[PDB]
Design a protein around this nucleic acid. Structure first.
Ligand SMILES: [Mg+2]
Ligand SMILES: [Mg+2]
Ligand SMILES: [Mg+2]
Ligand SMILES: [Mg+2]
Ligand SMILES: [Mg+2]
Ligand SMILES: [Mg+2]
Ligand SMILES: [Mg+2]
Ligand SMILES: [Mg+2]
Ligand SMILES: [Mg+2]
Ligand SMILES: [Mg+2]
Ligand SMILES: [Mg+2]
Ligand SMILES: [Mg+2]
Ligand SMILES: [Mg+2]
Ligand SMILES: [Mg+2]
Ligand SMILES: [Mg+2]
Ligand SMILES: [Mg+2]
Ligand SMILES: [Mg+2]
Ligand SMILES: [Mg+2]
Ligand SMILES: [Mg+2]
Ligand SMILES: [Mg+2]
Ligand SMILES: [Mg+2]
Ligand SMILES: [Mg+2]
Ligand SMILES: [Mg+2]
Ligand SMILES: [Mg+2]
Ligand SMILES: [Mg+2]
Lengths: 206, 100, 83, 127, 98, 152
RNA sequence: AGAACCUUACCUGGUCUUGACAUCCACGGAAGUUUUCAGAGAUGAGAAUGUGCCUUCGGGAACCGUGAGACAGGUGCUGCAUGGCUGUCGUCAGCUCGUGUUGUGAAAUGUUGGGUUAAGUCCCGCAACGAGCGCAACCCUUAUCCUUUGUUGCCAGCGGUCCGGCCGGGAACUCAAAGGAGACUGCCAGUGAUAAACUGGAGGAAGGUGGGGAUGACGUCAAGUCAUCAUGGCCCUUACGACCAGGGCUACACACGUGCUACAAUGGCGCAUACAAAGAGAAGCGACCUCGCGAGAGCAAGCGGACCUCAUAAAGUGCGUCGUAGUCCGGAUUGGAGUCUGCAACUCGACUCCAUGAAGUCGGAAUCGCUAGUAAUCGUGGAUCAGAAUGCCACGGUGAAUACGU
């Protein structure tokens, strides 16, 4: 059968939203449209910066964007010569003045998005999927994670028939609401087609 | 959808908001009860002159991302599929699964 | 249907063509694609070829036809029977 | 002094005041017979005060809101029983044994997606 | 006399905002009435979860809006000036009327 | 059911007679959830019958009730394609239920002008063994009489 | 979750070729505002006008036209090349792993046995010892009480009244929305293997999972979707790409699925009068007053809302009539006269008035849903939406019969 989104079912319990502004009906569609464009752009340039999440907030007639990254030095640039240009382009796109903050991600091997992106890159570079999946599981578990599950599906190895394979260690109780689960996905465009990757990481009870 | 449909929608919006005021004044003239039927006839003949695409009724709601013309929701500006996709990632503020 | 306070409906180009034809004698039949246009008493005695979707059907306006629309005299479906 | 009571039933809420008196019953600034044309509602209202037999020895001032007819009558029962408890405690076991004290928690079930009603299903055919 | 209305999607944030507003207003010297909770608004949506057919499979979502009212009586010229400069947290819609 | 968990539900007495059995009769006669109509109809019919008899509503209803209620019925039991018609007793509550149901169904099929008149005429007839309800009871008794060879 | 034009992907006709939609180079360049002729329109030609804005006066360029190709474009094929998403078995109680042991081996044990539960739920014994995904708990709503605040919500005790909580007033009460208590086989009795548990009783708003929702294990059906989107391979490039008008998707000897309205007296009609819940509102909802029999029209307050509008709830009740008739049941079809939305109601919209008054008297062989505030029946709101619900999604009123048993 099908499973519920691990993020969606815990938004009122343990997980917070990625957008934290208020608006009436007349502003709502425009706000989502601008947020979509901003996130797409920052994803476009900052690909080699290992950015996990982009939080967008709208205090009053302005905007504040906080990006979480594992390589803050390359994002910042030289004494801030890049944050200002990114700020100016975001201000151009959104139509309001902007301010940008950088948050460092300690232990980047415990973030599901980063692991998914790493696995995708390795698959693109022609690496055997079992090798990469086992490395991901070992790296996550050595840093104190309570559990990790990694699933890869698609036309594996260039075969004529697609299939799905997954590995798991620890506890991953998806039916427990209060539990802290980070779940995220990625796609790889190999010479034979697309390969999908999903990662679940279980951290703590409350 | 096709790029042609998106171009057509953009052009229709442009023509509509370009001719809004003139359409308003001619329609106001026609809708009046205290007037001259000759003036009403002239106004009717003039209203047909404008391009058909200037009518607001010629525009179809579509998803801001994909262009799907079915399943629209006015509150968000997206169809059902994209609403669910975005809402499951916490990108729509205050929205969550309901149960009562 | 059409509200009384608004009068009838006619197309400007069709009206122009009709007047130019009437003032200059009974000329050739007039091709037209306008089917939403009502029939005026000035049209009596004329021959108008109305589009039906694929071709132009000739209609000879008489005094009985005043009031309706042109498209009423150009069927758009072809049906002979079943079996 | 007035003895107070509150009753709830279905979607109706009622408030009741009881004092010494000669038997007057007022509901929403109207008499008992004026408010309820149905007889069952009348026996429903009068059951508690008849079980303990202080009909003409008390005066009742009641108001109601929401719901229909039987729901309002049940709310009136609940309120009058609670007020009688607040006026005398030696009667509690007597009214509990008659079921007057339990609050009826039956609500209406919501409509569910895919069904015509709360439980009725659409017509199913094998082929 | 001042009416203040606060709207928010979350109740914890708006409660903290109301607390800081009322404490700031009271430290100036004016008197306060509230906070009064107005009815919460619930907006519901129902959508299909399948790209093609399968009519009976749907999801249902809800948005809640919390709203509260605070009244300021005997305001001082310092009270209002401290009121604008409070810089309430983002995500709370504030309406002030006199 | 397989579980055997149910109990029994409480029934309210009738408005102006203080009887549960009349309330059950009203419920049996009710359609679409319109109880007031059914209770008015039954009250009118009972009043008319009491006037035309003189005893009361209560024991007149009772007397009609002993004349229609059954005492033994049949149940099917498949063996090898055909069925045994085994006779079994009826509990008193089921006796009352069957009596009332037969009475109501017989009264619904008549050609009078009003349902109250229909019910009054039928129940007065049944008070002394002339209606269709007593005929149905006699047929049930006869059918149960024939197949007593399988009554263990 | 709503085909007159548009949507539109299909048909006929008239037109385009670096192009309806992006980037690169060369050249004439404001952006726009009224205009006229020909044409079904696409388009072609023409007439006045602002021709700037930071600017090292070199201009960079929001953005218009021309010339080439590198390219753009495809709702074209393959769901049996794929990602993502969904249906179903099935909310069924199952599905595995590490180490040890047994077997030449596929494999087995654990997961079997006695009780017990809704449950691989729990207790005891056991060549097994432990662990994971499932079950249950954490989440939302309803039923009882407690504390804080009282406006636009409330009116028990007082003063006035135009009888209007209308005013002065009060924070008791309904109610609103934040935070707590509460239900745990907790206590009593009996059985039981002193265990797990089972039958009953007390208190309580609620008793043994109190009611309802969310939550769908490993997998099966080469199940559905290349037309939401994304994507390998194949295919077209003055056309399988692009623009416009008109038509079609609404046909009609027939067959089936899902519905609505009936065939009446537990009813039809007329007059008078009670009692809800939930929800929406700025290119919007629209009162009051006047005109019209009517759909509606004119003028026009209030509202971004516990305040204003939508917006008199219906079945019910009392009185009168009809008295079993294809009817004072039923409302299909058809003729005449209109209203409103919209450039435009012929094909092909909804609604109003007058006239007409079809089949239908409970439905063959067969077949469906439902265990309680349920079935049955009566009204109200919302999304889509210029206009267009008997469908879909929600909300309350009245309120049953039966379950011996497997
Ligand atoms: Mg495209
Ligand atoms: Mg439209
Ligand atoms: Mg509202
Ligand atoms: Mg069309
Ligand atoms: Mg698939
Ligand atoms: Mg061995
Ligand atoms: Mg097993
Ligand atoms: Mg085994
Ligand atoms: Mg064994
Ligand atoms: Mg066992
Ligand atoms: Mg278990
Ligand atoms: Mg569970
Ligand atoms: Mg008890
Ligand atoms: Mg008990
Ligand atoms: Mg297939
Ligand atoms: Mg498939
Ligand atoms: Mg197929
Ligand atoms: Mg296809
Ligand atoms: Mg067309
Ligand atoms: Mg169709
Ligand atoms: Mg009639
Ligand atoms: Mg008849
Ligand atoms: Mg008529
Ligand atoms: Mg059941
Ligand atoms: Mg209902």
């Amino acid at each position: 059968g099908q499973k519920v989104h691990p993020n969606g079912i815990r938004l009122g319990i343990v997980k917070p939203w990625n957008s934290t502004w208020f608006a009436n009906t007349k502003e709502f569609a425009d706000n989502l449209d601008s947020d979509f464009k901003v996130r797409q752009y920052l994803t476009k340039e900052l690909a080699k910066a290992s950015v996990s999440r982009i939080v967008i907030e709208r205090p009053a007639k302005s905007i504040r964007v906080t990006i979480h990254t594992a390589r803050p030095g390359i994002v910042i640039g030289k004494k801030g010569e890049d944050v200002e240009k990114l700020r100016k382009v975001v201000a151009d796109i959104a139509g309001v003045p902007a301010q940008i903050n950088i948050a460092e991600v300690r232990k980047p091997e415990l973030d599901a998005k980063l692991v998914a992106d790493s696995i995708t890159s390795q698959l693109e570079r022609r690496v055997m999927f079992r090798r990469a999946m086992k490395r991901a599981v070992q790296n996550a578990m050595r840093l104190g994670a309570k559990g990790i599950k990694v699933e890869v599906s698609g036309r594996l190895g260039g075969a004529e028939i697609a299939r799905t394979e997954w590995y798991r260690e620890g506890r991953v109780p998806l039916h427990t609401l209060r539990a802290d689960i980070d779940y995220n996905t990625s796609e790889a465009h190999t010479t034979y087609g697309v390969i999908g990757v999903k990662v679940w990481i279980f951290k703590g009870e409350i | 959808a096709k790029q042609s449909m998106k171009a057509r929608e953009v052009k229709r919006v442009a023509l509509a908001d370009k001719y809004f005021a003139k359409r308003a004044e001619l329609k106001a003239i026609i809708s009046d009860v205290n007037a001259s039927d000759e003036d009403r006839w002239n106004a009717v003949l003039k209203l047909q002159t404008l391009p058909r695409d200037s009518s607001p009724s010629r525009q179809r709601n579509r998803c801001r991302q994909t262009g799907r013309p079915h399943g629209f929701l006015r509150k968000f500006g997206l169809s059902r599929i994209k609403v669910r996709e975005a809402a499951m990632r916490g990108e729509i503020p205050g929205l969550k699964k309901a149960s009562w | 249907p059409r509200s009384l306070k608004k009068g009838p409906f006619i197309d400007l180009h069709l009206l122009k063509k009709v007047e130019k034809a009437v003032e200059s004698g009974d000329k050739k039949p007039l091709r037209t694609w306008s089917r939403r246009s009502t029939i005026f008493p000035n049209m009596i005695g004329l021959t108008i070829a109305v589009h039906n979707g694929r071709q132009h059907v000739p209609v000879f306006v008489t005094d009985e036809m005043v009031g309706h629309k042109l498209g009423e005299f150009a069927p758009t479906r072809t049906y002979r029977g079943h079996a | 002094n007035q003895y107070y009571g509150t009753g709830r039933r279905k979607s109706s809420a009622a408030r009741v005041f009881i004092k010494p008196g000669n038997g007057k019953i007022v509901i929403n600034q109207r008499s008992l017979e004026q408010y309820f044309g149905r007889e069952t509602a009348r026996m429903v209202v009068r059951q508690p005060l008849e079980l303990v037999d202080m009909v003409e020895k008390l005066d009742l001032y009641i108001t109601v809101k929401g719901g229909g007819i039987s729901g309002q009558a049940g709310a009136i029962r609940h309120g009058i029983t609670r007020a009688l408890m607040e006026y005398d405690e030696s009667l509690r076991s007597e009214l509990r044994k008659a079921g007057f004290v339990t609050r009826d928690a039956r609500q209406v079930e919501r409509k569910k997606v895919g069904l015509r009603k709360a439980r009725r299903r659409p017509q199913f055919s094998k082929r | 006399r001042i009416r203040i209305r606060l709207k928010a999607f979350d109740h914890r944030l708006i409660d903290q905002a109301t607390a800081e507003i009322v404490e700031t207003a009271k430290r100036t010297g004016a008197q306060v009435r509230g906070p009064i909770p107005l009815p919460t608004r619930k907006e519901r949506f129902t959508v299909l979860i399948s790209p093609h057919v399968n009519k009976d499979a749907r999801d249902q979502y809800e948005i809640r809006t919390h709203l509260r009212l605070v009244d300021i009586v005997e305001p001082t010229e310092k009270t209002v000036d401290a009121l604008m400069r409070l810089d309430l947290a983002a995500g709370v819609d504030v309406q002030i009327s006199l | 059911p397989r579980r055997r968990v149910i109990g029994q539900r409480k029934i309210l007495p009738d408005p102006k007679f203080g009887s549960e059995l009349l309330a059950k009769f009203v419920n049996i006669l009710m359609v679409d959830g319109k109880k007031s109509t059914a209770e008015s109809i039954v009250y009118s019919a009972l009043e008319t019958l009491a006037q035309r008899s003189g005893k009361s509503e209560l024991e007149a209803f009772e007397v009609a009730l002993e004349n229609v209620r059954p005492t033994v019925e049949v149940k099917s039991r498949r063996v090898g394609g055909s069925t045994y018609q085994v006779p079994v007793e009826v509990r008193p509550v089921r006796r009352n239920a069957l009596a009332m149901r037969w009475i109501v169904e017989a009264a619904r099929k008549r050609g009078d002008k009003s349902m109250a008149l229909r019910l009054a005429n039928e129940l007065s007839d049944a008070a002394e063994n002339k209606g269709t309800a007593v005929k149905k009871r006699e047929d049930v008794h006869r059918m149960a009489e024939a197949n007593k060879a399988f009554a263990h």
